[PDB]
Amino acid sequence: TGTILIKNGTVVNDDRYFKSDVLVENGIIKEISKNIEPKEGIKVVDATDKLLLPGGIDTHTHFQLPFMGTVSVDDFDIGTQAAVAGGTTFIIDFVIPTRGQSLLEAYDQWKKWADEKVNCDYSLHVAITWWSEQVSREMEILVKERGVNSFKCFMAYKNSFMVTDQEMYHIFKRCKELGAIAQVHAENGDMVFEGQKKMLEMGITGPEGHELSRPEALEAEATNRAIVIADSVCTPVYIVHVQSIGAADVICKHRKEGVRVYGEPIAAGLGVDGSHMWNHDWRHAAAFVMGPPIRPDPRTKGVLMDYLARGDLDCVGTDNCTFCADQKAMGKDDFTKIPNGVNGVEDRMSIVWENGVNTGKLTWCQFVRATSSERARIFNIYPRKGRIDVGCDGDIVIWDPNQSKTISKDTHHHAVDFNIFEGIKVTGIAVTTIVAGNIVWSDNKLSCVKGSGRFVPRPPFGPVFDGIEQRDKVRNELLRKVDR
Amino acid sequence: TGTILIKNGTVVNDDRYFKSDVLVENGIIKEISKNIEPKEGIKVVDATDKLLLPGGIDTHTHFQLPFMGTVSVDDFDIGTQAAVAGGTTFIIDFVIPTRGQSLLEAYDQWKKWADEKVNCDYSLHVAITWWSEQVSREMEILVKERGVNSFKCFMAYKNSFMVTDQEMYHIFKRCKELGAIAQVHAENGDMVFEGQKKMLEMGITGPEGHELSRPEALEAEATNRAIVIADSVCTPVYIVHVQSIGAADVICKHRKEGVRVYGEPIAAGLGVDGSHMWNHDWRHAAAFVMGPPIRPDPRTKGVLMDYLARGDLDCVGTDNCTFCADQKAMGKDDFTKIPNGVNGVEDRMSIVWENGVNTGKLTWCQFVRATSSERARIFNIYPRKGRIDVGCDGDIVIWDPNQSKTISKDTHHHAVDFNIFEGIKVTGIAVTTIVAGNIVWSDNKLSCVKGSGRFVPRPPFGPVFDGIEQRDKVRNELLRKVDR
Amino acid sequence: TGTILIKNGTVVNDDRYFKSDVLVENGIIKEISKNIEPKEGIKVVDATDKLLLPGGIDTHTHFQLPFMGTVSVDDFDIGTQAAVAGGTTFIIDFVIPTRGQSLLEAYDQWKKWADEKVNCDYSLHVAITWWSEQVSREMEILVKERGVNSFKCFMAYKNSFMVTDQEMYHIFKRCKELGAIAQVHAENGDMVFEGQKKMLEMGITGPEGHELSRPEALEAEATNRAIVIADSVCTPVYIVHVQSIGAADVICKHRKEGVRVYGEPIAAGLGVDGSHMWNHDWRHAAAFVMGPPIRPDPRTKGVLMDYLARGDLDCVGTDNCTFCADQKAMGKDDFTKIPNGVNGVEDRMSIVWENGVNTGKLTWCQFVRATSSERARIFNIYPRKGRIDVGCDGDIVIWDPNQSKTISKDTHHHAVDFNIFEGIKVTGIAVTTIVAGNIVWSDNKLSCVKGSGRFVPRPPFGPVFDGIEQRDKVRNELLRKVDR
Amino acid sequence: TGTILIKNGTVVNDDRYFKSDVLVENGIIKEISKNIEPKEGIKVVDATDKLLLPGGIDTHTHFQLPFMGTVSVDDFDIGTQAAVAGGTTFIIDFVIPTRGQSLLEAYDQWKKWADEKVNCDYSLHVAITWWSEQVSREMEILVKERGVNSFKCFMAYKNSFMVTDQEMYHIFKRCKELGAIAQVHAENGDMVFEGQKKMLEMGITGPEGHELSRPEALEAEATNRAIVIADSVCTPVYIVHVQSIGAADVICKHRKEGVRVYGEPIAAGLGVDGSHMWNHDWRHAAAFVMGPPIRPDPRTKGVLMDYLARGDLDCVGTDNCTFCADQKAMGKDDFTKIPNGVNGVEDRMSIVWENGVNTGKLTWCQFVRATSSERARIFNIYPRKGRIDVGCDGDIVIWDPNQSKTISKDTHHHAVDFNIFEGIKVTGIAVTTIVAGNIVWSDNKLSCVKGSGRFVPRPPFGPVFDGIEQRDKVRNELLRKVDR
Ligand SMILES: [Zn+2]
Ligand SMILES: [Zn+2]
Ligand SMILES: [Zn+2]
Ligand SMILES: [Zn+2]
Ligand SMILES: [Zn+2]
Ligand SMILES: [Zn+2]
Ligand SMILES: [Zn+2]
Ligand SMILES: [Zn+2]
């Protein structure tokens, strides 16, 4: 039906929380009121002592990602099952063209894989893995016709996706022109390449070689450069998987001066540290490898959450990019061949809850901002997503702030046989998830429908562009020309 | 009637803006919709090309303040007329007991003056000008019975209102216990007193002696100390009239580490600099005198707005405390006897607009946050105030972002014969103000009703206390006792 | 004789290091040259592969301190033996008047205790434990007649030594007038008192209660306030035992803006952390108690050394204030009655060496600055002390950067039966110490002469006052008076 | 003779100042003593009420620089005359190979031009304008045979000298290996190129187009990147002409964490602001053009001096690169063709004095550090240069802190017919300069000898490399390899 009535709980939006019953009809919220009588035949859910949160939005997923002939184990079906079991009802995945491949053809491939499989709504960012006139031209079609308002370039990955300062400059101008946000994987690629060469030459072949090849100052430098270029163009920039203190500090520094930069920590960075790469077990060590690496500095995750609470970091993704032991073992004598990526789609919200709320770092409202509402505004799908209000989509999570769980591979819903949050006790979990007025997770069991989810288009010139027309006006250099 | 229909404009809340018509019935918003047909006999206002903002909330007013036998010239009637002519539909004024005077008796006096005169809704903070057991006891009655959730102590004014560290500690614990926010006038009082003695001893008697007697480092030091004490108690603190870079930086520093501190710049600090105290005309110079002083550092107001945009400063007050030339002239041979205070209730919003929006520093939504919605949440009157939503109070401002005006005493609605924003050109003004569904400002004319406004109670344990129970839990020192 | 020739070593001053032989005659350096032939009968020391450093200067000692009827176990004889065994040839101790006691009478007592006992040269600071006209007057005699140029006030110790803002202001003006540096024990005394009351009321009686009663934000706040007051007066201020990151950051902040503030970390803060106060053994825990406490934040000592290397902290003292197990046990049911103080006079230099040099944090020259030369300039006894140059005092340490040692009570030369640096392995120690051309430590044995050491007077208006006359000129507020 | 006796003045070194007479014999300081009797026939100079400073060292000169077929107007003869008239007795100039030209052949050319012309001692840095195996190989000969210990690469000048991150990495490793300091012209070259294209396309052809083409964030970004790369290699880096607040802040940030970075402000940055590029007169505007540009932010020069005083910036150069009106006019319709460079060799010290000492920002000793002694240590020519001590070179400046002068082209000793410090009143000037015991400036007149000056070689592995062997040890990544 997509029709359900949720009674006796507390609604929590990012502006306030309050006691109210919520009615969803034909997948849309119809009524919010202190007491809604159940009519004949309507399904009723009890949220006594529980919270109604807008469904989580995961801004950073890589389901079913092709890599070196193999593929990520978590795909669009299993992946979205895991999402809703953890309170996340919307994922944004990355289209990743091969070099010289058309973005439209790559986009077509991605949307076909998803449309068939998704158990919840989704949308897509497009990575700019190579640059040319035709690429520039296909960006316009994506934005105008294919519901895209976000593009991603890489400062890392020399000899493949890496772009230069001159290219990045022009990519950002094109983003500006089309009203798209510009995303950046920000590490100094030339130095990551020299550091990989150095570590392997020293015989440091294990996963720990990964962190040592790329310390956090290379992430902070590249973050700095990408913001300086973006501020010159005068267009919104978005730093994906901000993993380090240094890079977080850079973002805070520039934001303070009024620069239009957004930042995205991820569940791994908020939940674990990089000392697992020094584990004597190779399998365990290699399982935590991703890029940028999870940082071994112990104060890292707390500081990332501090910035998150302040709004100097905006929203939490996962970078969900999962590979099995056998796939990971491709790099057993060479850390550079370990497929990069960890899990998080299922556990993001409970990890954010445990490390943010239960530490006193985040209030309930700041948790909703950090996990749905701000993402929605940034990618221009608010208030359809990320808000419990009349007219908005009936995607809702019944959250129990008092139920405990220890996270383990033995009980997760990922297709991969390892979890980086193994043994971590959390208090506060999703006990029922509702997508389009339908229960898809409840009583510790999934009731998904494969291919239920829909693609959601994202118009250009959203909130991230508010103020920029005026900024362009006041920064006009003709205002500063001397008439001689 | 308190019933009105506003058509063809854009609603602007602090989360998003959108095209919609707004219907107000019996003083409450009834319907928000893209097209509302006017019924028979209903008054219709056109907001074509205009914005519908929640009425401004001024957190810091001193209408009709007794001082040295005389009184502030702007009172509760004329004062609230000026407010609505500038888009402000809610003021919070300070009850100021004399030393040894009952707070309840002082509160009774204040509410009587206001109830008779106000043209818009209001509420009241209570200053703690002296400390004792009975004071502590009357705070409970105020909070429980008299609708107060905010108390103010002074670190300045030696030999009168000043409190010591030990007193401030206990006042904040009492605030914590009652669920009230703790406000602070933060200057080092002992040093302000020695600096006044020094300046006058040097023969520096003019208004410029005022700034020199109290440079900004005394404000920053006292701000620092008040937050450290408040963080130890673990209770929300609120820094009133943050006038300086140094004090703003201190607040940012502590907030970053997760300290629960709020800050309030004022219209004067956002709109002018303290170089007017060096004006060769004594009258002009003395007219800008207030405490803390307006700062002569030119980069001050821009930096205050930067912090405001970031949310490191929360909301804008006025410290509206107006005196005429004759009153100001009491201190003609002694700056210490110049009655302290300037205007701003009328011009706050246009000044914030001109310096925030038209500089590119603030978006439209961040302007609403800075002028209504955040104040409302902080003082626990959201979403009744500071939001255009169904069920909320029909206090609305029709804002024209494109109409210009030069501010002058020759056209203002203050009772005082001087304006600190004289000659300042602003673009973006309130063209119609609506309080409780009734037009009170339109077509450049007032149509107020004296004593129309109501007192609005403010429950304790509002948003400013979210997270604190958990913080108390995790900071519990018994968790850190060694069992020997 | 006080005559000795040191051959084959490297001289290390704070400006450069170089190979040279050093000749000392009648206690003064006579010649520095690449090759000095030994004459008939002259004693020769070999420093092949070793360094010649200026004798260490310990700016902060409390030998033989009266406390609650008992006395510190390390006195002026045993204490100075321990100093030279560790490479320190000059101590500055604090005269501490009782409240209402004459400073001159207290000074007389101190100098009598020392003159009889010291094995190396010394001098004395005077604490201002109470304030009055007569105190102000005795400060002038001390500075003019008794060789003192440094005075100390307390912001902590409510109901005893604590001074208010108004008193501190006037004490600093008096210091300014007399050309003395103003030292400050910087903790918020009112809050330390409320925190002690709170901890004991919770039943947290052990040493860990000490840290919890006084977290580092109370040190940082008081440091901040003391510098703001000192900058207003325009006179040099010196922060003793800077134990925390927060307080170090405050000093860096102000110094950057050009404020005349100096800071003194101590060997304990550079060498250990406060987690020893949570030791399950009461004796061990209580042994690390001092004020301000050693901080449990693990990154503390590294950050203190970073600032030291930068010159944002100037020189290292010890706060050597030692008590035996039996004395410590006075506070067995009450941490507030544990006599405050730890050891360090012997181990300061090796601890600074191990944590500064061997970490790569300090060069050899920066080590000499941090342990002698900067102290000497600050307290105006340079280049007589803290430099190997012709004409300078023949106090020299033969340092072996390659000899290792584990520090222990079983081998130290302190009179106390406990060492806070127990079990710490250091590489780089003093192997021979020379005071006034005489060997007092060599071949792991003492050869001191009791009462050999002399009192060294310290003229007012030293280096710490360079620039201040010009600062007073440019800050003259009459330059900013408006002529009306 | 090179023999002179200076009586009645105060010696000022960077560690202390003191009254003493100084005797120079055969060009070397022979005796320093409170009273030196003049023998028969010895020349005596009176420095009653005056200061004896070590001769100024200018680390950054471009005398006689070939540019676009023309040459800088100040050459090695006239240039060194101007230097000594301003108290500077040592210049370090840059050898600048054309692309594909041998460094040795370029070095040979430079040394030939200088040896014939210099009136005071000099030495040479070598710019790395292109990178190859042979270049790498010629660096070794320069360091081992030709007395060079400093090399310079460019991050600006796309399509000519610019180097990439990968090249810069390898250049710094080569510097490390040879014990040379690595200098960096730090602006983002790709962005400077796009900004030049943009400004000219907008029709902004005047000198103001220069600043607008290259705001300070491009200097701060490139400064940041060069330090991150240098810190990874673990070798000393030196930022030349630090012109901006942003870039100064970056250096402070990294230095704090212990990074081995040095910074060089220049006299123009310390003395004037970039608002002269907006002068309505084209000639005046174009005369202030250099790269990076002088910054129009008014608080710039004060903040640069603050950092200088702190030692976060080390020493002052000039970037003396002078062109006449006719040469400047090459870019009359195109700011990109204006030959870049301003004057400063003559006025550096008085400008530093006026803005540093007379503001209260620098003491006398910190002025000597900033103008000679620190440069000498950094480029490894201390204490031969930058110190008044026995054995050191008899290059001395008699400084009058009380003599005033207004700077003008009508009285300077530059060959160019314009001065950027025109009309600036300074108090404190060089009244007599002495090079190698000979008077070369006195009684407002030059008495130089052309080709008197000598080339001074600079050994590798100087002070800038102290600590680095230990840093390499502790940073060894093999210490962090997991043994599996
Ligand atoms: Zn990435
Ligand atoms: Zn990714
Ligand atoms: Zn106030
Ligand atoms: Zn007020
Ligand atoms: Zn103390
Ligand atoms: Zn002490
Ligand atoms: Zn350059
Ligand atoms: Zn240059």
Coordinates of N, CA, C and O in Angstrom, one line a residue, chain A residues 340-382:
Chain A
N340 N 41.2 -1.5 -2.5 CA 41.0 -0.5 -1.5 C 39.5 -0.4 -1.2 O 38.7 -0.2 -2.1
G341 N 39.1 -0.5 0.1 CA 37.8 -0.2 0.5 C 37.4 -1.0 1.7 O 37.8 -2.2 2.0
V342 N 36.4 -0.5 2.5 CA 35.9 -1.1 3.7 C 34.3 -1.0 3.6 O 33.7 -0.5 2.7
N343 N 33.7 -1.7 4.7 CA 32.2 -1.6 4.8 C 31.8 -0.4 5.6 O 32.5 0.2 6.4
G344 N 30.5 -0.1 5.5 CA 29.8 0.8 6.5 C 28.4 1.1 6.3 O 27.8 1.7 7.2
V345 N 27.8 0.8 5.1 CA 26.4 1.2 4.8 C 25.4 0.8 6.0 O 24.6 1.6 6.4
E346 N 25.6 -0.4 6.5 CA 24.7 -0.9 7.6 C 24.9 -0.2 8.9 O 24.0 0.2 9.6
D347 N 26.2 0.0 9.3 CA 26.5 0.4 10.6 C 26.8 1.9 10.8 O 26.9 2.4 11.9
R348 N 26.7 2.7 9.7 CA 27.0 4.1 9.8 C 26.2 4.8 10.9 O 26.8 5.4 11.7
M349 N 24.9 4.7 10.9 CA 24.1 5.4 11.9 C 24.3 5.1 13.3 O 24.3 6.0 14.2
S350 N 24.5 3.8 13.6 CA 24.7 3.4 15.0 C 26.1 3.7 15.4 O 26.3 4.1 16.6
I351 N 27.1 3.7 14.5 CA 28.4 4.2 14.8 C 28.4 5.7 15.1 O 29.1 6.2 16.0
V352 N 27.7 6.4 14.3 CA 27.6 7.9 14.5 C 26.9 8.1 15.8 O 27.3 9.0 16.6
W353 N 25.8 7.4 16.0 CA 25.1 7.5 17.3 C 26.0 7.2 18.5 O 26.0 8.0 19.5
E354 N 26.7 6.1 18.5 CA 27.5 5.7 19.6 C 28.6 6.7 19.9 O 28.9 7.1 21.1
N355 N 29.3 7.1 18.9 CA 30.5 8.0 19.0 C 30.1 9.5 19.1 O 30.9 10.3 19.5
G356 N 28.9 9.9 18.7 CA 28.4 11.3 18.7 C 27.4 11.5 19.8 O 27.7 12.4 20.7
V357 N 26.3 10.8 19.8 CA 25.3 11.1 20.8 C 25.8 10.6 22.2 O 25.8 11.4 23.2
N358 N 26.2 9.3 22.3 CA 26.5 8.8 23.6 C 27.7 9.3 24.3 O 27.9 9.1 25.5
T359 N 28.6 10.0 23.5 CA 29.7 10.8 24.1 C 29.3 12.2 24.5 O 30.1 12.9 25.1
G360 N 28.1 12.6 24.2 CA 27.6 14.0 24.5 C 28.0 15.0 23.4 O 27.7 16.2 23.5
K361 N 28.6 14.5 22.4 CA 29.2 15.3 21.3 C 28.1 15.8 20.4 O 28.1 17.0 19.9
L362 N 27.0 15.0 20.1 CA 25.9 15.4 19.3 C 24.6 15.3 20.1 O 24.4 14.3 20.7
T363 N 23.7 16.3 19.9 CA 22.3 16.1 20.3 C 21.6 15.3 19.2 O 22.1 14.9 18.2
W364 N 20.3 14.9 19.6 CA 19.5 14.2 18.7 C 19.3 14.9 17.3 O 19.3 14.3 16.2
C365 N 18.9 16.2 17.4 CA 18.8 17.0 16.2 C 20.0 17.1 15.3 O 20.0 17.1 14.1
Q366 N 21.2 17.3 15.9 CA 22.4 17.4 15.2 C 22.8 16.0 14.6 O 23.5 15.9 13.6
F367 N 22.3 14.9 15.2 CA 22.4 13.6 14.6 C 21.6 13.5 13.3 O 22.1 12.9 12.3
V368 N 20.4 14.0 13.3 CA 19.6 13.9 12.1 C 20.2 14.8 11.0 O 20.3 14.4 9.8
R369 N 20.7 16.0 11.3 CA 21.4 16.8 10.4 C 22.6 16.1 9.7 O 22.7 16.0 8.5
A370 N 23.4 15.5 10.6 CA 24.6 14.8 10.2 C 24.3 13.5 9.3 O 25.2 13.1 8.6
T371 N 23.2 12.9 9.5 CA 22.9 11.6 8.8 C 21.8 11.7 7.7 O 21.7 10.7 6.9
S372 N 21.0 12.8 7.6 CA 20.1 12.9 6.5 C 19.9 14.3 5.9 O 20.1 14.6 4.8
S373 N 19.5 15.2 6.8 CA 18.9 16.5 6.4 C 19.9 17.4 5.6 O 19.5 18.1 4.7
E374 N 21.1 17.4 6.1 CA 22.1 18.3 5.5 C 22.6 17.7 4.1 O 22.8 18.5 3.1
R375 N 22.8 16.4 4.0 CA 23.1 15.7 2.8 C 22.0 16.1 1.7 O 22.4 16.4 0.6
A376 N 20.7 16.0 2.2 CA 19.6 16.3 1.3 C 19.6 17.7 0.7 O 19.4 17.9 -0.5
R377 N 19.9 18.7 1.6 CA 20.0 20.1 1.1 C 21.2 20.3 0.2 O 21.1 20.9 -0.8
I378 N 22.3 19.6 0.5 CA 23.6 19.8 -0.3 C 23.4 19.2 -1.7 O 23.8 19.8 -2.6
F379 N 22.7 18.1 -1.8 CA 22.5 17.4 -3.1 C 21.1 17.7 -3.6 O 20.7 17.1 -4.6
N380 N 20.4 18.7 -3.0 CA 19.2 19.2 -3.6 C 18.0 18.3 -3.7 O 17.4 18.2 -4.8
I381 N 17.7 17.5 -2.6 CA 16.6 16.6 -2.6 C 15.8 16.8 -1.3 O 15.1 15.9 -0.8
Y382 N 16.0 18.0 -0.6 CA 15.3 18.4 0.5 C 14.1 19.3 0.1 O 14.3 20.1 -0.8

